[PDB]
Amino acid sequence: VRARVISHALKDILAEGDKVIIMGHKRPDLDAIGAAIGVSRFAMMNNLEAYIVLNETDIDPTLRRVMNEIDKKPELRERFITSDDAWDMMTSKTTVVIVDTHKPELVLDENVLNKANRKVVIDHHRRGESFISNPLLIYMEPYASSTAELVTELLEYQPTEQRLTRLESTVMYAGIIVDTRNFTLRTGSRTFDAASYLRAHGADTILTQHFLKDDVDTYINRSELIRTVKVEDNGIAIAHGSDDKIYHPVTVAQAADELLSLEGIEASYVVARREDNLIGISARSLGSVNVQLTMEALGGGGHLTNAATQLKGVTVEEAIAQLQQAITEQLSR
């Protein structure tokens, strides 16, 4: 009932203006792009004129493989425009739709946002300090998985003659896959309803897998860290890189995350040289062992399931020894 009311109100607004400018957040990910694609399909179903703001500097490596697919169909590709062309074509009757964010400084192009007289916000985060000013409509659902899921619900109440295409729903499906880490996070029944809808319109598993393929170098670095793991009977796992190899901090973080997927690990600590005078530790927990307190003890911090520290002037082995001492202190309380 709620999405039906929101869907028709949004169609009223979009047809009420002179054209639709759709904008995600800075450095868009596949949920922002998929949501925007979904909103531009919302508009074409009602024969409206809609564009998505996207600059060349905005296209990261994951977005670039998606664009390589989008390039193969000029109708979809023609809907993408730059900040400048969006600015030049905007009037006081233009509706800007902000997808997958609600804070003016995270918007992909603040100047397009500032020129906008008519604004719409669709987002799935919890509202904070800053907010898009004077929105005509707000679709915010902090429990939903993604903005793609939200925009999918809106599509269902719109005319079906100009259906969502196979590539369009593949990108939207990819956004849900990324935001939920393939249905393991923030995933409810309505997430699966949206996936059902997208799948019924041709959303492609194999093309989604293509967008999200892992690099081979980084799989081999990550696994170099993982293979060293030692697990105590209490479920504490420790893994390390050698004292003379510098690991990327994202690789360390991913190793600590991936250890939680192995049997019998309640909490993971990955220790790897970050600079020549700096050792990094990434700590992750299933939710019972408190890795926040362990990292705080060593001069870092974070949250109970997700924390880290950096240690100046020690070797990897010294940082392991200092980490084990923090763990002992904390379990004897």
Place this chain on the structure above:
Amino acid sequence: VRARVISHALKDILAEGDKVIIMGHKRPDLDAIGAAIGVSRFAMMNNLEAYIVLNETDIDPTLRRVMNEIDKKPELRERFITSDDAWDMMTSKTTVVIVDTHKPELVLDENVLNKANRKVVIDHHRRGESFISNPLLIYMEPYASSTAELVTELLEYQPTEQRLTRLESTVMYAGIIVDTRNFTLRTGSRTFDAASYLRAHGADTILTQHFLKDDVDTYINRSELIRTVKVEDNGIAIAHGSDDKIYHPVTVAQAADELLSLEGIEASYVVARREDNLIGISARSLGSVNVQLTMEALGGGGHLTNAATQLKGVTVEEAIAQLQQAITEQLSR
């Protein structure tokens, strides 16, 4: 749909008998068990009396984890009974329901099957040579993801007062996860519709991950194979173990599966010693290279995306040479 008619037809057959006894295949996995759970909830939704046949020798380690949660946390345990208790309990008025298989010699207990006058078959595979004899109702859907999906659809039409429980829908959900490898195989829109129903009834994805976690040694051994990969520009990837190290056959198969998640790999071939005189090769692809043809050229076979072969009397290097000879011959244009 076929699903409305079968659900009401099934309910009548089950209510006409004196009680329901439910069996999957030997060495049940989570689809078998989850489908059998779903069928027992189907009966309870109509206040019929239902049991699932399960012996201690049927319970592999994955199933043991599920059953531990079924001891510590439900009253689900009461509906699991041994072969002997099933036999002692049934009359010629008892309906036996076979889930997730249709061959009599793969059924969990063939004597319970033979003593049964009233039989029902629910399965999602292609009907083969042998078949359950004189069944009262046959529900074969070769393209459904799983039997858990099929049974989930039947539940929707039944009275809702004795609702599917959280732990019941979690197991059913887990069976879909295993059969689809997390929604990457045989996943249609009806697959997600079933996942939506189960998640709405409390299916726990974190508990589902818990049931399925790989141990550390399997990751180490699996990544030992993955590190060796060589990717060709045509997307052919080959990896191999040393000739003097024996790998477990599933580790090899999992190595080949996981290489498809890496950039540039259309098809994977993992070559590793299985015995002192036998080399295994597991092959996999994202559907664009036919690895059934590659493995048929070396005395094995399988399906276009999933194949293998075993080679007598060769070294890993000899096996790799024959593998590459087969590949250049097959991919030469």
